[PDB]
Amino acid sequence: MTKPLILASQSPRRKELLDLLQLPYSIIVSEVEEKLNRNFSPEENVQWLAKQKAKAVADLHPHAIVIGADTMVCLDGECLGKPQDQEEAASMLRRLSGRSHSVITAVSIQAENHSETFYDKTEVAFWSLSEEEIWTYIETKEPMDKAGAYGIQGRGALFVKKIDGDYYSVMGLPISKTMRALRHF
Amino acid sequence: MTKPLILASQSPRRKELLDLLQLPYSIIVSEVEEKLNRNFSPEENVQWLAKQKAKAVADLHPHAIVIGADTMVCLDGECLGKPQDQEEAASMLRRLSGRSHSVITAVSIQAENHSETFYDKTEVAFWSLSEEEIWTYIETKEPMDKAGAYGIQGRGALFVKKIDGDYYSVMGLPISKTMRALRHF
Numbered sequence: 001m002t003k004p005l006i007l008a009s010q011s012p013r014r015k016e017l018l019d020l021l022q023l024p025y026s027i028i029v030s031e032v033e034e035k036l037n038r039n040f041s042p043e044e045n046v047q048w049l050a051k052q053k054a055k056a057v058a059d060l061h062p063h064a065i066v067i068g069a070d071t072m073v074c075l076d077g078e079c080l081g082k083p084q085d086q087e088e089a090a091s092m093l094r095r096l097s098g099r100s101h102s103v104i105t106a107v108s109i110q111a112e113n114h115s116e117t118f119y120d121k122t123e124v125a126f127w128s129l130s131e132e133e134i135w136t137y138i139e140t141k142e143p144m145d146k147a148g149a150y151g152i153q154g155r156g157a158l159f160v161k162k163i164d165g166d167y168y169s170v171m172g173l174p175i176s177k178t179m180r181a182l183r184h185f
Numbered sequence: 186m187t188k189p190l191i192l193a194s195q196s197p198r199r200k201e202l203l204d205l206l207q208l209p210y211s212i213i214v215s216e217v218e219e220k221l222n223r224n225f226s227p228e229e230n231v232q233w234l235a236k237q238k239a240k241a242v243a244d245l246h247p248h249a250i251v252i253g254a255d256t257m258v259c260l261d262g263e264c265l266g267k268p269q270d271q272e273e274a275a276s277m278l279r280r281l282s283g284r285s286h287s288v289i290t291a292v293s294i295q296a297e298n299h300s301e302t303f304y305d306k307t308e309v310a311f312w313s314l315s316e317e318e319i320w321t322y323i324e325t326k327e328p329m330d331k332a333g334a335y336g337i338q339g340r341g342a343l344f345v346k347k348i349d350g351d352y353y354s355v356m357g358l359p360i361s362k363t364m365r366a367l368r369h370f
């Protein structure tokens with residue numbers, strides 16, 4: 001028969017995006033080791049992480065189709081994680097200011113008879129930022145929650161000059177590619 | 186940019202099946218010491234073997250799209266390999282005689298930004314075979330280099346009553362599904 005759909009992520013943004021497909025699903029997550037391999041490229045690491053998150057849940061629901069995903073913000077081969085302290089979030093934002101960075105989101109779809117994993121990369125260009133903007137933004141507490149210390153939605157939007165790629169992928173889920181992949185499941 | 190296509194397989198049938206896509210590609214020979222792990226189902230093992238073959242070549246040629254495949258012949262959960270002795274061939278054929286078995290073929294497609302693995306299962310039903318038929322067929326030496334001790338082409342074609350699935354997958358490569366998957370690469 002057909003298989004039930006599962007989203008192995010508690011990300012609010014991924015939920016609103018997958019809801020666009022109008023395909024019923026449940027959200028089920030099982031924590032996994034997320035320490036990245038020093039010898040993997042960012043492209044290899046982000047796909048590996050999406051793959052692990054999906055597989056942990058697929059192991060618990062072998063008759064389902066499980067979607068795992070992961071997003072990284074990388075600057076000059078170096079990727080920025082979520083800031084621990086405000087001065088770190090501030091340090092990240094100062095680094096992103098006035099230049100471009102890459103946002104890479106991987107998606108892994110797992111089922112017993114078919115698996116597929118891919119990444120989608122988007123170039124994000126920032127206007128030059130000032131300390132006031134940086135700290136004002138930091139106060140909102142929005143940065144303290146995402147990789148690279150910013151979100152393209154809400155107030156972070158004012159920082160973005162332009163993107164070359166997929167806005168939805170920057171939010172956390174390349175929805176058109178995900179929908180296209182699911183047709184073959 | 187596009188990516189060159191590579192078939193990680195020495196199988197003549199797979200080469201002739203991939204030729205139907207009329208896509209340019211090369212074949213790369215690889216020594217891969219891969220074995221089944223007893224804690225996997227035939228479905229998990231065949232997909233794992235196909236992925237290892239593709240990955241062994243993809244690791245060496247990261248810019249390409251690599252295709253790996255593997256086929257297993259299974260009877261009631263137990264899968265048959267090639268008979269290293271004619272008396273075994275006759276043994277396998279007798280098991281296969283007058284009943285149905287499963288031919289499971291997995292395909293794995295690997296690229297730096299996208300990977301996909303799946304299996305295709307086909308039910309193959311045999312006519313009740315006679316000792317004469319069986320032995321006479323073995324004397325042809327055709328079933329001695331084939332998993333399950335038979336081939337759906339050549340004289341073995343005379344043993345098959347019908348299939349429910351994909352004839353090309355039984356030969357070693359589900360071509361239509363492979364072509365369809367490649368469209369997303």
Ligand SMILES: OC[C@H]1O[C@@](CO)(O[C@H]2O[C@H](CO)[C@@H](O)[C@H](O)[C@H]2O)[C@@H](O)[C@@H]1O
Nearest residue numbers: 195212213214215216217218241242245
């Ligand atoms: O079957 C040849 C195939 O094996 C590889 C390893 O996968 O290389 C092996 O065989 C070569 C040719 O005989 C040797 O030169 C080499 O040292 C050995 O590893 C592939 O490179 C080759 O295509």
